[PDB]
Structures are given as structure tokens and as C-alpha cells.
Symmetry: C3
């Protein structure tokens, strides 16, 4: 019996131990100390209790699930997935996670320290899957919560390289579910064709979920893949920080986004992206409003580094039959972004900010306002015609740009003959610096191409920092665009040789509450009078001008044109110059035309 007890599975339970021989310490057994930790080895055994080695011909799923289920039953703990081994998963889970194509069911308070590698076996080729699932019911609305579940370590989740079998399939790494205080830290997710790597929350249910110091590498690989967002943040008070995202696939340049921020008080910070179509969507979907209300507010995209092929930040909000979503109180700051090398029009239209339609193309459902875009840099190579600081493609209730540096083809753009957004409260401060990479590339183009239904309560203060005489105009409003209660200015620097600076194809600058200024060339004739003598414009399209002043030198000795002008009822400009000697004078002069400024 002594020997038999010691050799039996209860042997460690008979060997005494006291910490460091301290007579004040608990008199324990070895088993009690070993029981303070737990690994997959404690469950990775045959029906006789003999350990099984992991490998490509072993399905580790049931063993990991048994470990999770047991630790849960004791109120939680942390299960180690050992280093130096690859643990393969080769079958679906059962029960509530089956409605999610789930492999492993996560449980509250049960953390996973992944030090080794978790691979998917070829069972999963061409099939849907969600590797780790925190829902406990196939219907998320009927699911319980997942709380206090953290996945962390130096290890790896490898999706086996398998393509999707059909575009309608879904694949995920970690779905925390209705998740409260859950996180992923340090993990590398790689080698897949998946929809998401990590999802947080469900339709606003959850809180305090985070993804930190994770790597996401090569997670789209086929034309079958319908769509990819690496992290979907669908609960408030949650976010992504200090992560690395990389794709190499052509497909990823057309379909993949790094982050979705879909509920209030969410953030995306300090991360690096390469090879993606898109950086982040910041969106309130009415269809996702159940758990945390109808407003996405306190949305922060800061201090990221990106090389993308489409758009960096995409804003949206939409409606359902019974709910209306709203997006407000957003900050986009400190990001350094560029469109990677590509042919013009070879990926979705390049942009720093996109105001996008809804998923069904509607541009008249959005309620997006109180956005601050400040202190960012954007660059697109000179060949990329389709590059803009903002593509403004749906109704906009406000967006403010201050102190950014935008070096791309367009500043503000929307395609003509497409949507006709209603724009309010678009503010483009004079402190936005417009780069010169695309100088000479702009034939036929307007730098600010105001292809909108209407613009109200808006400010566009254009400041060039180099010449680009190729552009048709600095800013153009088609006659279809109403303009009211707005300030539009074009600083004169680098504009002396421009044929057109600001263009109002419907004469909209004449509006009662339109405040404008821009340079123009004007032909003047004087009267014959020696001495103080009036000069008048030969054209009559200045009835809107409140004052104008000279931007040209006077090469003459015997007279000078007026330094300043106002107008007359018939639309001429008039000012008082000086004839040292009499005579009718005729001059062409560059003027700053001003209205109410």
C-alpha cells in the first residue's frame, strides 16, 4: 500500500510539502501546489488517462474543451497551451456554439495563455468556422454573457491557409460574444482566408473589451472571400491599441479593412497597417443598436501608421424600419497614412476620410456630425488620380478639418453625376496644408470639386503652398449646388497665373450670406480727367463685389490705377486713381475680389 499509493494518481497527494521549510507555512501536499496551475496536458489524454501527443493527426479540440469546462466549474483560472508544440483542431464543437460554426467554447473567468501554436486541420478546408466562441446559444439574442475572459501570450493561431469555399461563409478567430471585460494580448493570427480575426461584443452588448499588441498577418487569400475586417468592435468602452496588421494578397487591397468601430466610446490607437484596402470604419448601424443605444459617439482614431489602397477612415450611419443610427463626437488625429503604389483606379477610390453611403447605396439616411480631423498626414503618389483628402459621397451634417497636411490629387471630391449629398458644417481651416506631389497632374480637374446638392454653414479656406497651373480651378461649384451661409476663400499665393481660382457656375457667390474672396484678372478703363480720376471695369459681372484691391504692380509713371475698388449697380467695379497727366487709360490688373470679407 505505501508504494502503490505513491505510484498511483493520488501519490502526489501523499507527499508532504512546506514552502521553503518555513515552519510558519501551510503543511501541504505536492498535489496541492501542482493544482495551483493547469495546462492542456492535464486534459489531453485517452479514455485510460494516458497522455496523447499533439500533432497533425490528432484533434485536440475535445481536450481543450474539457479543460475549459473543468476550470470554469472551479470559478476560473488560466489554462496554458504549452510552448514547443502545435495543437491542431480538427472538428466542430457542439451545443450553443454550433450555430456559429464554433470550434471551442470560451467560458467566463477562464483565461487562455497561448504559448504554443494552435493550427486548423484540413477538415476545415472550404468550410466556415469560428475558432473560439463566447456565445452560449446559437441565437445571439438568447445567449448568456462572457465575462472576464483573456487570451494572451507569445503564441500563434494559424488558420491553415485554406480558402473559403463560398462567399456566403463566415470565418473568425475569436468571437467573444456578449462580452464584458474580455481581451486578446500578444497573439499572432496568421495564414488564413477569414472574415474577421476578432470580434468584440454583439449589437452593443458588452463592455471593456480590448485587442492589444496582437499581430494579424496574411488573413485574406482568395477571390471567394466576400469581405474582411480584422477586428470588429461591437460593444462600447472597447478598442484596439498597439497592433500590427499586414496583408500581401491582391484581394486584400480591394476588400480588407483593419478595424470596425461600431459603438460608443471606442478607439483605435497606435497601430500599423500595411496591404489593406481600408483602415477603419466608424459607423452606427441602426441594425446594431440594441445593446448600447442609437448613437456612436466618443470615437477615436489616433496615432496610427498606414499604407492602404482605398480609404483610411470611413464614416457612416443608417436606419432600419424602426431605428435610426447617429454618429457624432469623433476625433481622427496624429495618423500618418499613404496610398500605396498602384495604378489609378485599380482599387477603391483613395481617400483619407470617406463619407460613405449605407450598405445598400443610400446617401440620404446619414446623421454624421461633430467630427474633428486634425494633425494628420496623407500622401498619395502623383499618378493616383483617385486620391482625395475627403470623398464626400453621402449626406454630411458636419466635419471639421484643422492643421492637417494633405498631399493627393483632390482636397474635397465627389463624383459628378453620382450622389448629390446635402452638406452642412463642412469646415476646412486655412491651417490645412495642401501638398505639391500632384502639381502638373490636374488638367481638367478642380482641387475642391463641390459636386453636392447643397452646401450650408461651411468654410473652405484654400491655401496653396506651390503652383499648380494645370488645375482648372482651386474650387468649383456646379450650378446644381446651392451655396448659402458659407465662407469660401482662395489665398492669392501661387495663384497669379491661374485663369480660374474660384468658380461658381450658378453665380452662387452672390448670395446674401456668402462670404468670399479670390483673385481675378480685370480690365479697366479710366476717364480722361487729369488728377484724381475714376477707373471702371469693362465687364459687368461684379455686382456681388463689396471691395477689391490690386495684386499687380503699376509699370506706368504718368498715372496709377486705384489701389482699391468697390462696385456700381450695373456690375462694374469702380475706383479712384490718379492721372499725373490727363488721358484715357486702359489697364489689365490682377485683383483680389472680396464679398463681405
Amino acid at each position: 500500500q505505501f508504494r502503490a499509493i505513491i505510484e498511483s494518481p493520488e501519490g502526489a497527494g501523499h507527499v508532504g510539502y512546506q514552502y521553503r521549510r518555513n515552519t510558519g507555512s501551510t503543511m501541504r501536499m505536492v498535489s496541492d501546489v501542482l493544482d495551483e496551475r493547469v495546462s492542456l496536458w492535464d486534459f489531453h489524454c485517452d479514455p485510460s488517462g494516458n497522455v496523447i501527443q499533439p500533432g497533425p493527426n490528432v484533434d485536440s479540440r475535445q481536450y481543450l474543451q474539457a479543460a475549459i469546462d473543468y476550470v470554469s466549474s472551479n470559478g476560473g483560472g488560466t489554462i496554458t497551451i504549452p510552448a514547443g508544440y502545435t495543437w491542431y483542431l480538427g472538428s466542430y464543437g457542439v451545443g450553443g456554439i454550433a450555430g456559429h460554426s464554433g470550434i471551442i467554447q470560451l467560458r467566463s473567468n477562464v483565461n487562455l495563455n497561448i504559448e504554443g501554436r494552435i493550427h486548423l486541420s484540413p477538415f476545415f478546408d472550404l468550410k466556415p468556422f469560428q475558432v473560439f466562441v463566447g456565445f452560449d446559444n446559437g441565437d445571439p439574442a438568447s445567449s448568456g454573457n462572457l465575462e472576464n475572459c483573456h487570451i494572451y501570450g507569445h503564441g500563434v493561431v494559424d488558420f491553415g491557409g485554406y480558402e473559403f469555399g463560398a462567399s456566403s461563409q463566415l470565418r473568425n478567430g475569436v468571437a467573444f460574444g456578449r462580452s464584458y471585460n474580455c481581451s486578446v494580448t500578444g497573439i499572432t493570427f496568421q495564414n488564413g482566408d477569414v472574415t474577421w480575426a476578432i470580434t468584440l461584443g454583439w449589437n452593443g452588448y458588452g463592455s471593456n473589451c480590448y485587442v492589444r499588441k496582437c499581430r494579424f498577418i496574411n488573413l485574406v487569400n482568395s477571390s471567394v472571400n466576400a469581405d474582411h475586417s480584422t477586428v470588429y468592435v461591437n460593444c462600447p468602452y472597447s478598442g484596439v491599441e498597439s497592433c500590427y496588421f499586414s496583408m500581401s494578397s491582391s484581394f486584400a487591397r480591394n476588400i480588407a479593412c483593419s478595424v470596425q468601430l461600431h459603438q460608443h466610446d471606442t478607439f483605435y490607437r497606435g497601430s500599423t497597417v500595411n496591404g489593406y484596402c481600408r483602415g477603419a470604419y466608424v459607423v452606427m448601424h441602426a441594425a446594431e443598436a440594441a445593446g448600447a443605444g442609437s448613437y456612436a459617439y466618443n470615437m477615436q482614431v489616433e496615432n496610427n501608421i498606414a499604407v492602404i489602397y482605398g480609404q483610411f477612415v470611413i464614416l457612416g450611419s443608417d436606419v432600419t424600419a424602426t431605428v435610426s443610427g447617429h454618429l457624432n463626437d469623433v476625433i481622427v488625429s496624429g495618423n500618418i497614412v499613404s496610398i500605396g503604389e498602384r495604378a489609378a483606379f485599380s482599387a477603391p477610390f483613395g481617400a483619407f476620410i470617406d463619407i460613405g453611403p449605407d450598405n445598400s447605396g443610400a446617401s440620404n439616411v446619414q446623421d454624421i456630425q461633430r467630427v474633428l480631423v486634425t494633425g494628420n498626414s496623407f500622401y498619395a503618389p502623383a499618378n493616383i488620380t483617385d486620391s482625395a483628402a475627403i470623398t464626400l459621397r453621402a449626406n454630411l451634417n458636419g466635419c471639421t478639418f484643422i492643421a492637417n497636411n494633405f498631399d493627393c490629387r483632390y482636397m474635397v471630391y465627389n463624383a459628378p453625376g453620382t450622389t448629390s449629398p446635402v452638406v452642412q458644417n463642412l469646415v476646412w481651416d486655412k491651417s490645412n496644408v495642401i501638398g505639391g506631389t500632384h502639381a502638373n497632374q490636374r488638367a481638367g480637374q478642380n482641387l475642391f470639386d463641390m459636386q453636392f446638392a447643397s452646401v450650408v454653414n461651411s468654410t473652405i479656406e484654400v491655401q496653396l503652398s506651390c503652383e499648380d497651373l494645370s488645375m482648372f480651378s482651386c474650387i468649383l461649384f456646379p450650378a446644381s449646388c446651392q451655396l448659402s451661409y458659407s465662407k469660401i476663400t482662395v489665398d492669392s499665393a501661387w495663384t497669379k497665373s491661374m485663369s480660374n481660382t474660384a468658380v461658381f457656375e450658378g453665380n452662387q457667390q452672390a448670395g446674401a450670406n456668402v462670404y468670399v474672396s479670390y483673385p481675378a484678372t480685370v480690365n479697366l478703363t479710366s476717364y480722361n480727367t487729369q488728377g484724381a480720376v475714376p477707373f471702371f471695369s469693362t465687364d459687368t459681372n461684379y455686382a456681388w463685389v463689396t471691395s477689391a484691391y490690386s495684386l499687380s504692380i503699376n509699370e506706368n509713371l504718368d498715372f496709377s490705377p486705384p489701389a482699391t475698388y468697390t462696385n456700381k449697380a450695373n456690375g462694374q467695379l469702380v475706383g479712384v486713381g490718379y492721372n499725373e497727366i490727363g488721358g484715357v487709360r486702359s489697364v489689365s490688373v490682377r485683383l483680389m475680389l472680396q464679398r463681405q470679407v
Copy 2:
């Protein structure tokens, strides 16, 4: 004897072990390997060495203290507080921590990995307490240091929900003391009525202390609670990053602040706050200047998200009989903040920046300068009368605002008939965007209400981005406010219909070194002369004007008023217009009035 040895507490000390059967590895005993780790179980035992189960009727204090004391004696290590259990504390500690109402005494090099839960028992109801204390003497000035002490894990400190018994009591979670290289990471502090959750340092003594990835939830619950600051940073080279702070109590909206930054080279970054009165104080108290000098400099509040009811950042500095505190070299950047939904005047006056008096109400002791506030967003709902970008309530030696977006009732405010601050070096750049939420709400109010003793070396460049004809003025200086060596401008956009733009109730704009411009309506009469003809203002209050220019169109054919004006000794404006046909002219015109700009 073999069997007896094995079953005894030294048994593990007799069972040999060699790592992985490696013949090159140390020949050890099992006990040596078990001795590499340590948990509360190794000390949580009765006088006979039998383990005690934790629970609500067990006081775990003495056992945890014994563990800390023993590990300290070996030069440190990390004690695990096991997952799956709640460890209750039910008595005060003894010795040096007793003067701090202490429960547990922390010791140098002894880290706590809290995986389970630490609860306070009802012994503590209505009483003061500090759960973990790093002082070793009841007099902090006589205390030794705490160094290299880190508290981390997935676990919880729960304060038991108990109210304070008297407002004069103090409660804390972690007081590191005179703390060098100490930190808290990952811990949830919840369910309390406390003064602080964590304090770092003591009166400038300490260094390199941090709070990272912690949660602070529902830490004020009663009207008895005098005051709450969740983290008090009282040593240099220290800070708070990536934390979550939430309150639900009405009381918290009136009393609670998230962070105190009280010594140089301190920071508060990347955190989310909801339900608090205040975000952070940035203060140099003379009474706290012993350990790190009399200056708080290199103070950083960046990239936070907040919903508060009072003020986001509060600046201060003060004096004692023998020490003077100074605050300088501060940056507040990238924050997105809003005043939560509340009635006007129902909480402390809403503000992004407050320049506050000292704790005894004095407004003439401060030395605050070299502050940069840039790239932040602030919003307050339209009903909140008491909302301002800056409430400037005490003497200010400098503060600079660049490229912020402020959407609230006031830009600059101080209450009339209260303090009369002396203001120097207040810079409000034109790149600050003024939102429109409060348009139409401003009857009787001045957007910039300059209720100061004096303003010098200051810049206010007002730029509207929508109309608000309800306001009395854009900026007003009462006659009691001296103004000198300053630049005050009001851009004309959205101002055509304003009765008052800039108001100087003491004619201060006439100062020799005052540089101003703002719009006004002026009535002009001309002489009868055909040809070049002067126009003169009918009022005589323009003796300060250096130039003026038209902001109005000229509806006439037969004449034009001057485009530009200067003045005359008697205070009229004068300019040269043009009478195509003679006659006395009378016009009303909107002018930009300029002085030295």
C-alpha cells in the same frame, strides 16, 4: 522512517527531480522546484499548519501579511492571490501602517499577482481604511521607501459597497508611499465609497510609478464622501495610461475627479472616463513640494476620451508661508470630451480648461504659464448655459490654444462680479473652430466674456463658422478690464447682421499697443462735388481707427462711396468716393474697422 519522511512536510525535499531527464541539468528535489513559486495558500493556515479556506467569515489579512513579510525576507518575489476564490479582509494592520488606517503593508521587491478577488468585510463599514500601504511609519516624513513593488493581474479589489461614516475619513486602495518603480496593471477596483483608488508617491518623493490598464468602477456612492480623485500622482516621472474610469452616482458628478497630476514629468494618456465631475487636475501645491522641487513642469494630458459634468482639466498653483508653487510646460492634446446630459447649473460649471483658485479660494497666488492646448474636441449640449472652452477664474501667466474645436456656450468666460484675474499671454489662435450647437441660445451673453482685471500680451482671433445673432457680442471687455499690448480680431464671416461684434466698454481698443479689427455699421455723408468726392462718417467715435474698408455692395449707379477710409482728428472716418453726377450722398455701410492691422 522512509514513509514517515515522505508523508511529513519535508517529504518533497526527499523526492529527486532532474528537468526533462536531462543529464546535464541540476539534480534537485521536488521541494526546490515548488519553492520557485509562492501563493497565499502557503501562508493561509491555522497554528497547526492546516490550510484555511477563505470566505466571508474568514479574515485573510494576517495570512497575506505573513506571506509578504516572508517573501520580503528573501529579497522579493511574486505572491499569487489565487483565481477562483474571494479573499476577505476583516481587520486593521499593525505598526507603521496603523497611522494610515492600513490593512496590508506592502514591502519592497514583493509583487502581488492578484488573480482572484480581494473583498472588504463589514468590519470596515462606516470606517476609514487604506487597503495596501507602502509607508512603513505612521508619519510619512519618517517613512522609509517602497521600491520595486508591482500589483498586477486579472483580479479585483472590491470595497464592499460601504459608505463613509464621516466626511473627514479617508479611504484608499493602494498607497504606494515614498514609492520608486511601483505599478498597478490590469486590476479592477470597484464597488466603494472612497477618497482615492491609488496614490503614487508622497509630496514629491518617489519616481517611475504607473497605473496601466486598470478599471475603476463605482467608487463614490454617498453624500458623506467629501471628495474623490481616483489616482493621485504625487511623484515625478510617473503616470496613468490606458485606464477605464466609470461612476454612476449622482454624487460622483459633483465631487469625483479621475486623476491628479501633482509633480513634474507626469502624464495621463489614452484613458476613458464616464460619470465623473472632473477629468484631471494639473497642479503644483506648495504644500507638496518637498521631494521634487517647487515646479510642476512637463505635464501631459493626451488622447483621452471623457464624459464629465464639470471640468476636464483644471490648472492650479499656490503658496504656503515658505514655499511658492509654479506650473509651467503643460500640453493638453488629442482629447475628446463632452459635458454629459444635464440641466444648466446642476453641476460645477462646465469647462474644457479651468484656471482655478486655490483650495481656500485665492485667485492671486497662481504662477501658471507655458501651457499648450491643441487638437482637442469639446462638446456641451445646447441647454448647458454653464459651458466654456476656458473658465479663467484665477491669475494666468500664459495659456495657448491652437487648432481645437470647441462647441459650447462660451469660449472664454469668467463670472462678473466675482474674481478679477490678472491675465497675461492668453493666446487664442484663429485655427480654433467655434461650433454651432449653442447658436440661438446666447441672448444677453458675450461669446468671449472678458471679465478680468487686466489683459496683456494676449491674442483673441475670433472666427465664427455659423451665425448666432442671439449673442450680445462676440467679445466684450468691461470698462474695469485694462487691455494693452494685445491683438483682438473678429473675422467678418457670419457677422453681417450683428449689432455688436467686439465691444470695449472702456474704449480700450484705443490703446497705443492694441491691435484690433472688427466689423461695424457706419453712416456716411458726402460733399456735393461732382467727381472725386469725400465721404465722412456722421459719428465721431473713430479716432482710434487706422483704416477701414467696405463690406457692403453699392446699389447705386450715379456714385460710389469709398472702398477704404482713414480717419481725422475729430474722430470721423473719411474716404474718397466718386460722384458721376453731383449731389450730397447719404449711405449706411458695413465696414471692417482696423487699428494697426
Copy 3:
């Protein structure tokens, strides 16, 4: 035999264990569970397998190397360096690391959890060393990679205080080598005279290497030390975050830099520096371009706090016989920096941004462009003559400044009679706020001292916020500096009493594509005519002026000078004023002179 087996090193291999008595768990032996972890104790033994205690007379090197080598052979894991002990290293390693003066060779997948202390023994006094080396060959070009190697914990690497023996020696803490997914977290590096603490990558080979939450304290101590950079980042997709850097040595104020960012997609964030010469270099060395190309792009320096004695960020790029390096797409944001207290000229010239020559002094090899410097604060005490926002000492292809607050002696500076940079695309937005600390200190100095060969496509919008009548000028161009296609403006506020505002010593403001404005004092005489009457300047150096306007009041009743002026062919200004009564008038007036603006 039972007893002998149990007492032998295989004893633990005979004692059965089953986790928590769970009948579903693996039937293991105690040794299997102990084998899940590994420490230095498992290798720190004599040839008979008896444990050796560490200490100052024990060389732990061979034991730690044996541990690393063994764990590597099993596919990796984490070796604990135990707390409560100091482990001394006292000899060089052997093999591939010997060409790097290496002590310990790191291996892939083998992490080090340093909880205790690692000290260098006096064997290393006056000698080179690299403590941990990830190269596997003495020739880095012939080295294999290091991957998945993480060093972390609460412990310490102490360099023993030893001085360098010769300036040509190199010393390092961690050289990861050709390093992929390697990191250091939490470690304190202290007490040394070293070249680097940590190097990441080798000549562009590597990826995803990081330094987080580390401390670097007193790592230069002698005049022998040639040069120090605490972290050298020489692989892409890598960076430094949330670290603390401190020096106390006089030598460090002249030689030490905190960070080198030398490859694309690298970052330096959230860190605090004190006592260093320099903050960070951001450089593309042609000599380092092998692994990741010839371009350093996506370079981010954000949200740091620093007290330095030289320059905060230094930009560079250079060439070799066959490679050309390029630097572009850089952002420097949110930093708060100051030059520490020191005498003028007592350390390298103080600067926020330096555009530095190459290591051999060449100023005509650089290709630096697309840089955004925004939302930073800089301060230097008033005595520090040698302090500038930017020292622009080498060719510059672009740099943009928006919304910074610079409080130092110079805004833009280069020494006269030194290099003559070619400058393109230097943009200084009007939103940069110029502080007043150095007011009254600027006798003989130009605030913007444009000591360049040429300036093109540049913008300098000078805005003062207080007077400084000591300065010679706000901006000066020597006649040797060509100026073209540029915008130079001096706002009038605080300039009324300045003798010189903008100075063009070669009359460069007359260029066809130069856009300028600045204040000047001008003497005017009128004709005798009653009524509208011309005024003309008595000097003739205004042939470049397109318009001018009054900045002065008119003290006269009987006449007024013109509000606005243009010029004439002979270089006079001319405008139309008004003589109520006739007579020749003579006045001196402050004008805003304008050219093409």
C-alpha cells in the same frame, strides 16, 4: 529499489498525479508537471549536478547558455531568471557571438523572464561586450535569424559601472540581430558606460521588434565613451513605446541620444527622457539599406516628454558609392520638450528639429521631404542663445510646421558662413505660436535667419504674440540666398515700433513669384491741391509693391493721407488723399506693404 528510485533524480517521475483529483484528467507523474516550467536553477550546477549558488565570485554565463541551448532544442519556452538573486556574468561566450564581443547567445522561441538581477563582473572592466546577442555568426551578413524571442519581467540588467577602455570599443545590452518578432518589456537597464542598451534588426533585416515599458538609467559615465544611443531601431515595423530614459552624466548631455529610427514603419511614442543630448534621430543611411530598401518612410515620433541639452529630432539621409538613402513621410506630433538649464553654447546647438549633415559633414546628399511637425511644444530658457525651432543645416526637400508652440531664441536658423543649404517646400503656417521667453535678448539677431543658398516653394507666416524690439528683424534673407515661388508675411501685431520687420538684403522680394507683406514706415509728401489730392513717397524703393495700406491714425483735421496706395514706375508709392484746405502736406506713416497678396 522503491526508496532508491524515489530519492534518485528520477523519483518525481514515479510519483503519480492527476489534476485536482479529476477522474477525467491525465494520469501524470510529478516530473511531467514540473517539466512545464524551467528556470536557471535547472542548469546552474556543477559537473556532479549539485546546485551552485550565484554570487559575485560565480560566473553564471555557461549555465544560462546551457539553459537557452536546451530549451531551444525543444522548440522554445520561457526561462525564469529567479527573483531574489543576483546572477553575475564573468566571461565571454563562444562561437558565432564572439565576433560581437557577446556574452549570451539568444535563440529563437526561447524567451527570458528576468525577475532577478543580471550583473556584469569586473572581468568586463575596460572591455567591449554585448550581453545578449541574437546573431549566430560573427559576420552579420552570414548570420541566421532570431525569431520569437522576448525578454520581459521586473528584473534588472546592471552594467557594473565600468568605464569604456577605449573609444573604439562597442558595448550593448541586447542585440537581437536579424530579428523577427522580438521584444523587451519591463526591464531596467542601469549603471553603465555603453554604446547602446538595445539594438533591433540589422541593416533593415528584421520585423516586429519592440521595446516597451523599459527603463534606461545612467548608461554613460565617461569621457572615453565615443557615442551613445539607447535604442537603435534597424528593422521595419518596429518601435519604442512607454519607456523611461535618464542620464545624470555631464558626458551624456554632449553625446547621448535616446532612440534611432533607421527603417520604415518605425515609431517612438509615449516616452520620457531626461539628461540626454538628443531625443531621436530619424535617418535613412544608405549603408543600412540592404534588408528593407532605400527609403525610410512612415516614421512617427509622438507624445513624448523630454528634457534634453541638444536637439530633440534630427533628420538625415545619405549616400554610398552605390546606394542613395531617402527620408520621407514623417510625423512629429504631441511632444513636449525643453532644453534643460545650461549656459549658452555649452552643449550642441539647441533645437526642436535639426536637419543635419551626414556623418562626414556633407550637406548636399540629403533627400528629406514630406515631414509634418504639428502640435508640439518647445521651450528653452532665455539665456540659451543657441536654441531654435529648426536648425536647417543641410539640403531640405520639404518640411511642414503647423500648430506648434515654439518658445526659444530662433524660429529658423542656420549659421552664417557655414553650410549653404538648398531649401524647398519649407512651410511655416501662421498657426505656429512664437513665445516670449527670449524677448529683449535678441540684439543683433534675426528671428528667422535665412542663411541658405536658396529657398523655393516655401511659406513663412510670421505671427508675434508679444513685442521684442531687441531683435534686428523678424526675418532676414542675405543677398546670397535666392528666393523664388515663396510666400513671406509678417503680421503687424506687436510690430509698430520695429525698425525692420522683413529684410531682403538682395531685394529678393521683387521676384516675379514672390508673395510678401510686411510693415514699414514711409514718408509721404502731397501736392498743394484742395480736395482729392495725391500723396507720394519721398523714397523710391517701392517698385515691387502692389498695394499698401495705413497702419497709423491721422492726427490732422484739415487733411487726410490716403488709406491705400499703389506704386509708380520710379518706385514711389502713390495714393489719393483729401485736403479739406489746400497746402503741401508731409507725413510719416506706418504702412502694410504688400506684393501680390
